[PDB]
Design a binder for these strands. Sequence first.
RNA 1: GUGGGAGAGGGUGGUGGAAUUCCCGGAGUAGCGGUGAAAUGCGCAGAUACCGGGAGGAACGCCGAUGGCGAAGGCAGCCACCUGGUCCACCCGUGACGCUGAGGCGCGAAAGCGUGGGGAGCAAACCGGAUUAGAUACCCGGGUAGUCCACGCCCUAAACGAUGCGCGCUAGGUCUCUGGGUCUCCUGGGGGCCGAAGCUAACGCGUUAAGCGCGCCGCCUGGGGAGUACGGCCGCAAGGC
Lengths: 116, 101, 87, 70
Amino acid sequence: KRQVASGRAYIHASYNNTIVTITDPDGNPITWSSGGVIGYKGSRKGTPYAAQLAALDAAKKAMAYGMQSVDVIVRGTGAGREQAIRALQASGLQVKSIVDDTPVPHNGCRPKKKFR
Amino acid sequence: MRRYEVNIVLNPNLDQSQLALEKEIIQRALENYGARVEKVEELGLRRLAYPIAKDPQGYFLWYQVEMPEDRVNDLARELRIRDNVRRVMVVKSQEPFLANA
Amino acid sequence: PITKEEKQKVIQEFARFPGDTGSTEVQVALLTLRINRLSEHLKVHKKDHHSHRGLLMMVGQRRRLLRYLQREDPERYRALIEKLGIR
Amino acid sequence: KAKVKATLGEFDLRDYRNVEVLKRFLSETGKILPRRRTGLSAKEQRILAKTIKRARILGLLPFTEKLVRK
RNA sequence: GUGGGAGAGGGUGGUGGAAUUCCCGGAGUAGCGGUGAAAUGCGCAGAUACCGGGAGGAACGCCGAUGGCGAAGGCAGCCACCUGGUCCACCCGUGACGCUGAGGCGCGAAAGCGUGGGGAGCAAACCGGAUUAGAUACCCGGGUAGUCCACGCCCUAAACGAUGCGCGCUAGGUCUCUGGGUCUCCUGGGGGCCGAAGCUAACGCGUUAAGCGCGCCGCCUGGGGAGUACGGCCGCAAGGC
Ligand SMILES: [Mg+2]
Ligand SMILES: [Mg+2]
Ligand SMILES: [Mg+2]
Ligand SMILES: [Mg+2]
Ligand SMILES: [Mg+2]
Ligand SMILES: [Mg+2]
Ligand SMILES: [Mg+2]
Ligand SMILES: [Mg+2]
Ligand SMILES: [Mg+2]
Ligand SMILES: [Mg+2]
Ligand SMILES: [Mg+2]
Ligand SMILES: [Mg+2]
Ligand SMILES: [Mg+2]
Ligand SMILES: [Mg+2]
Ligand SMILES: [Mg+2]
Ligand SMILES: [Mg+2]
Ligand SMILES: [Mg+2]
Ligand SMILES: [Mg+2]
Ligand SMILES: [Mg+2]
Ligand SMILES: [Mg+2]
Ligand SMILES: [Mg+2]
Ligand SMILES: [Mg+2]
Ligand SMILES: [Mg+2]
Ligand SMILES: [Mg+2]
Ligand SMILES: [Mg+2]
Ligand SMILES: [Mg+2]
Ligand SMILES: [Mg+2]
Ligand SMILES: [Mg+2]
Ligand SMILES: [Mg+2]
Ligand SMILES: [Mg+2]
Ligand SMILES: [Mg+2]
Ligand SMILES: [Mg+2]
Ligand SMILES: [Mg+2]
Ligand SMILES: [Mg+2]
Ligand SMILES: [Mg+2]
Ligand SMILES: [Mg+2]
Ligand SMILES: [Mg+2]
Ligand SMILES: [Mg+2]
Ligand SMILES: [Mg+2]
Ligand SMILES: [Mg+2]
Ligand SMILES: [Mg+2]
Ligand SMILES: [Mg+2]
Ligand SMILES: [Mg+2]
């Protein structure tokens, strides 16, 4: 019920999970998907396959809104980050540009013991 | 009395009356803190590399001065009071170190 | 800080003869100038220790120069002290 | 690979107001380039860093950028 | 003395951006998180992911080094001010004014104590989840002191080069920071690596000595008992010498 047809695709990838958000060109999200959205539950949500299927689900839900062009924004590093970009390219959505936005501090905050 | 360079970046969206007013106020502020003005470069509107005060661009002025050291910090405070002034950077002057020379 | 003419005025003041930059009298004078400055800067910034070490060292130097002057010419010593306001 | 300094004239390493030059010392991202890239001497590099950071504070140069391709 | 120089050396004030958290708004559903796998936890009072705005604290990515400064502890955004140390050149002034240093006095990471602030993130204690014969431990979710600032105490440490300070003398080669020079190189001051002579129980050290010498200070005298006891001094306490 929109007719967007051009917009942003954000891929947020951690080691635990992968989530994708399709949004309009001014940043408001249209649809979204994740490892858990498709049937996976545990560790299984971090596989590159899950990332694939999540990209694909999100792109389907995009077609329903009549999406065509996508600007990809990649954040984070985890397995199937690249698999999600991959699946998204061959999804039928024709991507415009891919960009790595991963946030890094200028050293603000103490990390948990696991991260130091 | 040392040799300084006062950088001022103010709001690009000002018209002539406004800009002239902020500028005159700045002049007055220098005269008050005993800053003689050796030279002035006003480059005006330029595109900032990151947005400052929600503006993508800014208005630039540069004043080389000679003023009393003890007053300098105080001078800075005054210049920042104006809302319309987004950046004030005062810098002790240096000789032009050269490279590939 | 201490600038060139600020310093020179003192050198002239305490020099034994024209062109004397090096005598015990002059060294002590200069040292005292520095010392007093530092003491004023340590009345504020009571938390600046690294400078206080410097103070101790300058004070030491002065005392050595003075003990030497006093050992060689006692009169020059008394004179120097009277002028400077030490001890 | 040819160093940044290699293509440039006599230029002020102390000019924080000159972007047309300083831009060439930054990466695809906002980052200040290593000496391996900038060809500068120790002292040179050390000055260029200060100059860059000054310019950044003035909004004339970016603190960070985003990476294309990928 | 004059003239140059490099520097996260120190104190005060100000300012910048990234990120975390929380609050406000839009858009948007069914999960997110997390692990070896999980669960507690959080989510329909709309979370996570995305965009805009705001508040607040703490720490400064790239530069960054095998780098620099400091007597040591230790010091990293940018700016200004106040200030310590130090290197080089000129060979200008004083004329042995030197070295060391029991006691004293001062500085002294972290934790810790007192009074008052501050409190984002992390987090001893604590409260939970799962692993596993079991748990108080390693993994997971929460979490208070604390970590931050002011002032006043505490005086410890693998406070490590496990190497007291100073001066003279004894092959080089090589990488480097910082000066001066008639700048293939030379000369001075730092930082490293190999190695002459020599030293060393060996490992190793070797113009940054652990070599050859001189001066002065501190310290050792088998292991345990024990850094304990008694005593004294210091400390609000912990506790220290
Ligand atoms: Mg997971
Ligand atoms: Mg410093
Ligand atoms: Mg400081
Ligand atoms: Mg919201
Ligand atoms: Mg559930
Ligand atoms: Mg529930
Ligand atoms: Mg925000
Ligand atoms: Mg708050
Ligand atoms: Mg690094
Ligand atoms: Mg180091
Ligand atoms: Mg250390
Ligand atoms: Mg200085
Ligand atoms: Mg002579
Ligand atoms: Mg003579
Ligand atoms: Mg001594
Ligand atoms: Mg003793
Ligand atoms: Mg002693
Ligand atoms: Mg301490
Ligand atoms: Mg502490
Ligand atoms: Mg207690
Ligand atoms: Mg306290
Ligand atoms: Mg925990
Ligand atoms: Mg077990
Ligand atoms: Mg258990
Ligand atoms: Mg437990
Ligand atoms: Mg936590
Ligand atoms: Mg000995
Ligand atoms: Mg060598
Ligand atoms: Mg040299
Ligand atoms: Mg040279
Ligand atoms: Mg050397
Ligand atoms: Mg041999
Ligand atoms: Mg021997
Ligand atoms: Mg042997
Ligand atoms: Mg060796
Ligand atoms: Mg020796
Ligand atoms: Mg030995
Ligand atoms: Mg015995
Ligand atoms: Mg015994
Ligand atoms: Mg004890
Ligand atoms: Mg006792
Ligand atoms: Mg008592
Ligand atoms: Mg104890």
